[PDB]
Structures are given as C-alpha cells and as structure tokens.
C-alpha cells in the first residue's frame, strides 16, 4: 500500500517535475527501448530513433496519465480504468514490461531531480510506479 508519506513524496516529486513531465516520459521510453530492446516489439509501427516525434507524443500521453494518477492517488483504479481496459484487451503488453518502463521512469526522474531524489523519495516513487503497473494489468485475466 502507498502510505501517507509515500503519497506526500510522490506528489512532491511529480510536482517538481511539473511541466517537464512530457519530456521525461519520452526520455523514459527512449531509455527503455535502448536498455530493454524486447520492449520495441510493442511499437513496430513507430520510428523509435532518438528525437522521434512519435516517441515524444507517446511520452506525453504516458506522463499525462501519471499526472492524473498522482492527482487521484487515493482512487487510482477508477482514474486508470480506461487505460487498464486498453492494455488488458487491445494492447496486451505482457505484464513483465511494466517493471522495465517503471525502472526507466525512475532513472529519468533520478537524472533530473538532484535534490528531490532522496532515498526515501526513490522508495516511494518505486512503490507508486509498481502500484500504477498493478492497476494497469489488473484486468488482464
């Protein structure tokens, strides 16, 4: 479960991210495609080169969804229900990939948050992204 401290840390960190959220989402995707190449199998129609506008646009969507999750951190299943449907029944991304994207989101945040990415905030953000991942895979079977 996300504790009161976890939610505080997540809102603090994502608040410092602020309007860079979309850029950071694109960067996290780029990091994922290079570090974990099997994840590219879900984007065969994309140009995945560095600076790709398709990766930028998808990064914005991913980040906005996380912003919405943070804004609804007490009732995240409902906030994310449409995305849970989409991933469970159309995209059908194997659940193991969510840990890979979560790690790359954490690395991206770390690379941009010199003061904020304390050990405690790191722990909270990892729990938060695991919880988002759990919600997003909750309707798979």
């Amino acid at each position: 479960v996300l504790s009161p401290a976890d939610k505080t840390n997540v809102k603090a960190a994502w608040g410092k991210v602020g309007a860079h959220a979309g850029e950071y989402g694109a960067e996290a995707l780029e990091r994922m495609f290079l570090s974990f190449p099997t994840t590219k199998t879900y984007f065969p129609h994309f140009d995945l080169s560095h600076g790709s506008a398709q990766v930028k646009g998808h990064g914005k969507k991913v980040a906005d969804a996380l912003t919405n999750a943070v804004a609804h951190v007490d009732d995240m299943p409902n906030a994310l229900s449409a995305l849970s449907d989409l991933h469970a029944h159309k995209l059908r991304v194997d659940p193991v990939n969510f840990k890979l994207l979560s790690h790359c989101l954490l690395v991206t945040l770390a690379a941009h948050l010199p003061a904020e990415f304390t050990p405690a905030v790191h722990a909270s953000l990892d729990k938060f992204l695991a919880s988002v991942s759990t919600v997003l895979t909750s309707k798979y079977r």
Binding site: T38, T41, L91, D94, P95, N97, R141
Partner: protein, 144 residues
C-alpha cells in the same frame, strides 16, 4: 544438461504425440495468459476456453511450434545456433516479446505433468525446465 537429464528428456519425449501436445499447449497459453491472443486476431473464435481449445487454427499453429521445438531436442548442445534465424524472425517480422516463449515453456511443463502424471517426477521436471529455459533463451538471443 547432465547425461542422465538428457536421457530423461528423450525417454519421456518419445511418448509424446507432438501434434496433440502442441495444440493443447498453445490453446492453454491463450486460455491461461489471454494477452497472448494478441498475435492471433486472424484465427477466428477465441471467445471461450472451449472455443480456443477447439479452434483449428490454434491447433495448427500449435503443431507447427511444437514440431520445431521437438526437432530442436536433437540439438540440445547447440540451441542458439539452431534457433538463431527463427529468433531473428520472431523479433524482426513477428514482433513477439520473448516473454511469450517463457510462458509457453511453463505451459508445456504443466501439460507434460498433466499428461504423464507421476512419471513426470521432480527430477524429470528439472530437466525439462532446463530445456524450456534454453529454448526460450535461444529464441530470445538475437533480439536487439
């Protein structure tokens, strides 16, 4: 694999109806892990477990996949070279996340346990676990 582990694999596999086990293993993959259906939109009715298991296109692909698996058991000392170009195919053209190979390997182990019962002993299982992990690793190896 040890020599005894190799012997255990071959002796059990000589009793397998590859077409039947392949059809059932692929069917059970699509039932137990239904996101794996994403590759098979063209296969017709997958609406129920019975529909999946009865689906002729599912059975046909299961025969093909497990036939290749079966022929690969003659090359346990060279799985990577055996499956390199099939690895490339699954990456490049088919866009199959290699996690699917690991899920299918685990379903195959469950099918062998169900089919053979007590003959599928803990040591026979351990041997087959090395096999399905090795095939999955070989099929994933060319991914980039």
């Amino acid at each position: 694999l040890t020599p005894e582990e190799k012997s255990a694999v071959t002796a059990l596999w000589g009793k397998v109806n590859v077409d039947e086990v392949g059809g059932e293993a692929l069917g059970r993959l699509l039932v137990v892990y239904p996101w794996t259906q994403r590759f098979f939109e063209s296969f017709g009715d997958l609406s129920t477990p019975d529909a999946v298991m009865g689906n002729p296109k599912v059975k046909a692909h299961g025969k093909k996949v497990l036939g290749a698996f079966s022929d690969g058991l003659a090359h346990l000392d060279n799985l990577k070279g055996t499956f390199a170009t099939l690895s490339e195919l699954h990456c490049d053209k088919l866009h199959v996340d290699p996690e699917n190979f690991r899920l299918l390997g685990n379903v195959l182990v469950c099918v062998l346990a169900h089919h053979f019962g007590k003959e599928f002993t803990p040591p026979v299982q351990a041997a087959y676990q090395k096999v399905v992990a090795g095939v999955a690793n070989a099929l994933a190896h060319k991914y980039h």
